Design a protein around this ligand. Structure first.
Ligand SMILES: *[C@@H]1O[C@H](CO)[C@@H](O[C@@H]2O[C@H](CO)[C@@H](O)[C@H](O)[C@H]2NC(C)=O)[C@H](O)[C@H]1NC(C)=O
Ligand SMILES: *[C@@H]1O[C@H](CO)[C@@H](O[C@@H]2O[C@H](CO)[C@@H](O)[C@H](O)[C@H]2NC(C)=O)[C@H](O)[C@H]1NC(C)=O
Ligand SMILES: CC(=O)N[C@@H]1[C@@H](O)[C@H](O)[C@@H](CO)O[C@H]1O
Ligand SMILES: *[C@@H]1O[C@H](CO)[C@@H](O)[C@H](O)[C@H]1NC(C)=O
Ligand SMILES: *[C@@H]1O[C@H](CO)[C@@H](O)[C@H](O)[C@H]1NC(C)=O
Ligand SMILES: *[C@@H]1O[C@H](CO)[C@@H](O)[C@H](O)[C@H]1NC(C)=O
Ligand SMILES: *[C@@H]1O[C@H](CO)[C@@H](O)[C@H](O)[C@H]1NC(C)=O
Ligand SMILES: *[C@@H]1O[C@H](CO)[C@@H](O)[C@H](O)[C@H]1NC(C)=O
Ligand SMILES: *[C@@H]1O[C@H](CO)[C@@H](O)[C@H](O)[C@H]1NC(C)=O
Lengths: 530, 530, 246
């Protein structure tokens, strides 16, 4: 089937889904391929073409180091890119319900991967199920990542930082100009992303540029105010230089460092990236977003406090076990291959892995708030506690704190705490309800009968409906199959719905005790040293 | 007199009314005659004409089976079409006050007849009285009905469903483009309809298409949420196919079934219509509205709950005896020709007629809530109770429930309970204040002195004034002839005005006990079986 | 309860449900609460397939056999509705399904829902009311694991028996201590907080919101609308099926 866009005609394909039809346009270019001179620059606009683009393959993932800790292990490879890596990677997918609606609501997916990795083309981001089941147009884009997407040399026009964010933004502009031709409704666009894809979404709530480019926003396990999310102006300078040194790019004429790196291979850049930071963590974001003065026009960490953002409804949530995923990538005593029971000495071995540049009081205080058990019996004591440290600290408390500061200014916020564990989950039980493992449900994967427990097909169906109802109508309610209605998260009561296969309840003040610590006591201990 | 419309000049006539003058344009085409290829398709736009249309006859009623249960009986023939049946029937009438106003408020009539029947041209829908008495422009249209108006083959472009609704919609667009030429005010249009004409109006409150095509809405004895009102996507599929089989239209190439039926006679279609459903009821709506994804963009039954509809004032009401009308068309023991006293065995004989696909608990529960009398004396016990079952269930509870869920979202809702019985009524006393017998009063029929009790001339004059004041000003008050003012129906108190010839009172919570049953206990009993 | 309280005209002057409906009761504070598994204790004393000596993993038919036991004079359709509400299995998996179904049927109907209804009707007249959900299995419990947090077995803790450093785990001695402090505080001060050992404060059960406090060795949350679905069934729907029954 053919569709006429502002750049030229495009040819898509017709997938068979649930005894009916969806129409897919995979890998549509939306920007000029950021090659050679353009590398590091903001995405340039795209020249028209008088033929037809064959939007029938998935396109290239952007350049990134691939995870190699567990080769052949699905648990980690289901996250690895499944298309040729290439600097020529600025493409987007569109999935339309059949028959062409009408004036359809648009869902836009922004993938995560701590700004270092990710790709639109993953199987768990397959938009076909959503389009067909809920008659929505789903859209996802590739945007640059790592130094190629986030190299900052402050103010300097040929290395401004936030390139990857601009990529998302331009893709959003594409949908604003072109989606009507597809039957979609530019005045209803919900942005949705996960982890660093959620920090991204949250940043678009701040970005004067993005402001008129979407209606609403969904924020799965991530927000700009999370500790990993935003690079300071001068951490970024330091990093860009350290790279220059690691590759033989040191100079004086500052533009030349950028002429220097423009001429290296993606690979001389890639291998060195991991080494530009003094001491790492498994969550180290070497090239993420910076306050660039163009995209972000001022520290986000302030715009929030003073109410400067798009005022609209938001859906935000986290997972029961955000922190476990990380423990197998640095923390002594941990292996995906046994019950990972750990010793107190090892817990502290662990604390230095996750908080390397922190005081002795910092750690001993973390230690104290997390390790006074009612019955110091359960051999899993420490193992569970290192996970909650990593979780609460980097994901839960930031997310809840974001939802507070934002809903403070009059808008509707709904919050979820997702806590069912996939029957299919390739990691072991101790790891629980890991980071990034609700995406399957959101994208409606357990809907595909030929796979999942029947319970999970109910659970995906709910989340799917709830999501679409939020996109369409600004309300993540599921009205038919007798549910319990989802209360709006206000600053006093602080209500959030729990998601699982066997009892959704309304609960208040998630992580009360633990966010206090992370939100006031701990940062105070940090003021004392550094 | 001549008027220039966007399609061409039109010639109307001048009726003599109440010692003054009204100007009438009967049977104006507003769509392309849905013939041959167009049958089943949405109404096509209409080519200009350079002569003059002679809008001086009533036009054709659309094809429908006529009621033949009581030939010669006025009570049923006053409802039967009074113009040649024809597939060429998309016409509208306009009645203008003389002399040509000005910037007049517009009332639009949508006739009922459980989507199977009806016609604009009935004597009880004569708009001349209203136009003259209240200086309003009245407008009514013919729209397709039965399978010809509501054949659904989901998404399939040449049999989309809701054709008859689109007919109404296009007629509404006509008024938006043309009414100013007549002296009417497109920024004040009240929609008003009865029964299935009220379900229609309620559907236009949901329909993105209709949204900017009227100001306000009046809903007499009907709403989409009534049990008869809306066909499920797959009841509709099943029905369309069963028809195909009943006529020798079975196929595989699905479009061909539609090419097949396109080539049959209205009559091979008509006689079979009654037979496409497994078991009937006297209220069976074989081809009604469906969730089509184009007109209705999602289950209405949800759009309501989530507040997605035109936010405006509404007038809604029912009649003291909505249910009696139906009892003479299936229910054992019932005849318009004696006091129809019935036995308990027969009451249950009756319950299976009106609830055929329901459990044994379903019926025995209905039985229980309706048949515990204070004094099981009155021989009319069961007779009255089968009427209220049919009434409360299909008309009263749905209507009240609609008024709740809608007014929940901030708009003004007024509710009436009309309860005077026409002195002229051709059916017998036991039947009481039947379904569809307030229309006479609304259209101002007892105003025509030469006929009705003087009391009824007062009663019509009130309702007439109240209606116009709602259309013009959004307030169904009657300020002069010392009335009692009509309170707004809010969700707490739930006030409604009673209409009759000898005491209008403000009362609360109509049918409290009975709607509880129909609204929670009963549907719960239904969850247990099916 | 073959020989119990009646309206004698002397101790109870009128029907208790009336007195409660119309607010004829001593206006004061109360502390109410129930145990996670009230019902189970009674399934060993009559219900087919139940023993304190095994798995007790029962089949559908012994579920219905069991219903006949606990609802002797309840209509054909009456029982069937209790069946539908509690056997709503998303996945037909757990071999332990109907076992817990029956547990809950007996608990919700005889203990939890009447307790909850009680607190509402009482709070409605504007006295403080405190509701708890005791959800901790004593390690000492002689009864089998499946019987859970049984009827009667919160008393050990209220009377301070886990305080005896000679027996109970150390956590049970913490939980017992709090409960003991909460209990004494309430009695002294009409307010069952544990203000020291940094508790989570225990809010009033207001007629609207329906807050309650969970009591355990572990996750001590404040929660809302306990057994909300189950008690709608027992509160309004089931009493409307009894009105047909006879
Ligand atoms: C699970 O596996 C891990 C990793 O294989 C075991 O952790 C190891 O502990 C010993 C001494 O600390 C060393 O042989 C390894 O170097 C450790 N792993 C690393 C690299 O940190 C752990 O003991 C196992 N746990 C069990 C059996 O529960
Ligand atoms: C009123 O008339 C009706 C219909 O003519 C009478 O109902 C009939 O009852 C007997 C036995 O049930 C039969 O002769 C008919 O078949 C019935 N009608 C039908 C078709 O259902 C009814 O008895 C009369 N009632 C009175 C005298 O009050
Ligand atoms: C498998 C199982 O444990 N079931 C038995 C049951 O058949 C027996 O009647 C009951 C009472 O003695 O004890 C137990
Ligand atoms: C894509 O393939 C189609 C086959 O139908 C063909 O028309 C065309 O050559 C291809 N498009 C391009 C970009 O050449
Ligand atoms: C889609 O809906 C919006 C309002 O949400 C409206 O303004 C727009 O015109 C509609 N577009 C089409 C083509 O239906
Ligand atoms: C609700 O109804 C049934 C389960 O009874 C299920 O098949 C259907 O998908 C549900 N709908 C939603 C949107 O959850
Ligand atoms: C309608 O009748 C009038 C008589 O005044 C005449 O002018 C005309 O021929 C007729 N119109 C049409 C459609 O021919
Ligand atoms: C009629 O009234 C409306 C306001 O209700 C106004 O905007 C419009 O211009 C008026 N039209 C004429 C022709 O008087
Ligand atoms: C009120 O006044 C008289 C009855 O006294 C009647 O003729 C007139 O029509 C009434 N007006 C209305 C609008 O009811």
């Amino acid at each position: 089937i053919i569709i006429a866009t502002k750049n030229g005609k495009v040819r898509g394909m017709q997938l068979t889904v649930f005894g009916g039809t969806v129409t897919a346009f995979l890998g549509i270019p939306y920007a000029q391929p950021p090659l050679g001179r353009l590398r590091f620059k903001k995405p340039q606009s795209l020249t028209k073409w008088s033929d037809i683009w064959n939007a029938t393959k998935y396109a290239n993932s952007c350049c990134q180091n691939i995870d190699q800790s567990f080769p052949g292990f699905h648990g980690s490879e289901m996250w690895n890119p499944n298309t040729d890596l290439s600097e020529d990677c600025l493409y987007l997918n569109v999935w339309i319900p059949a028959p062409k609606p009408k004036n359809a609501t648009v869902l836009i997916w922004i993938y995560g991967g701590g700004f270092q990795t990710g790709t639109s083309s993953l199987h768990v981001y397959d938009g076909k199920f959503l389009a067909r089941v809920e008659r929505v147009i789903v859209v996802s884009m590739n945007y640059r990542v790592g130094a190629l997407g986030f190299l900052a040399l402050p103010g300097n026009p040929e290395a401004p930082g936030n390139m990857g964010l601009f990529d998302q933004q331009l893709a959003l502009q594409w949908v604003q100009k072109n989606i009507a031709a597809f039957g979609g409704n530019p005045k209803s666009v919900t942005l949705f992303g996960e982890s660093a894809g959620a920090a991204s979404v949250s940043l678009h709530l701040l970005s004067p540029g993005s402001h008129s480019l979407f209606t609403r926003a969904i924020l799965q396990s991530g927000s700009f105010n999370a500790p990993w999310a935003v690079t300071s102006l001068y951490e970024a300078r330091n990093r860009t230089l350290n790279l220059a040194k690691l590759t033989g790019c040191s100079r004086e004429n500052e533009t030349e460092i950028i002429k220097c790196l423009r001429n290296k291979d993606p690979q001389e850049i890639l291998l060195n990236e991991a080494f530009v930071v003094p001491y790492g963590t498994p969550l180290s974001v070497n090239f993420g977003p910076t306050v660039d003065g163009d995209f972000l026009t001022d520290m986000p960490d302030i715009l929030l406090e003073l109410g400067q953002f798009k005022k609209t409804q938001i859906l935000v949530g986290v997972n029961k076990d955000e922190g476990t995923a990380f423990l197998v990538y640095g923390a002594p005593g941990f292996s995906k291959d046994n019950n990972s029971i750990i010793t107190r000495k090892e817990f502290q071995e662990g604390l230095k892995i996750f908080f390397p540049g922190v005081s002795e009081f910092g750690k001993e205080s973390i230690l104290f708030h997390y390790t006074d058990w009612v019955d110091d019996q359960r051999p899993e004591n420490y193992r569970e506690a290192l996970g909650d440290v990593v979780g609460d600290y980097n994901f839960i408390c930031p997310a809840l704190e974001f939802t507070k500061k934002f809903s403070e200014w009059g808008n509707n916020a709904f919050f979820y705490y997702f806590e069912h564990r996939s029957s299919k989950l390739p990691w072991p039980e101790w790891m629980g309800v890991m980071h990034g493992y609700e995406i399957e449900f959101v994208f409606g994967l357990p809907l595909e009968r030929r796979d999942y427990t029947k319970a999970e097909e109910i659970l995906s169906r709910s989340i799917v409906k709830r999501w679409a109802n939020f996109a369409k109508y600004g309300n993540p309610q599921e009205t038919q199959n007798q549910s319990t209605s989802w209360p709006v998260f206000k600053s006093t009561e602080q209500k959030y719905l729990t998601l699982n296969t066997e009892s959704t309840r309304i609960m208040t003040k998630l992580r009360a005790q633990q966010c206090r610590f992370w939100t006031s006591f701990f940062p105070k201990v940090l003021e004392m040293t550094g």
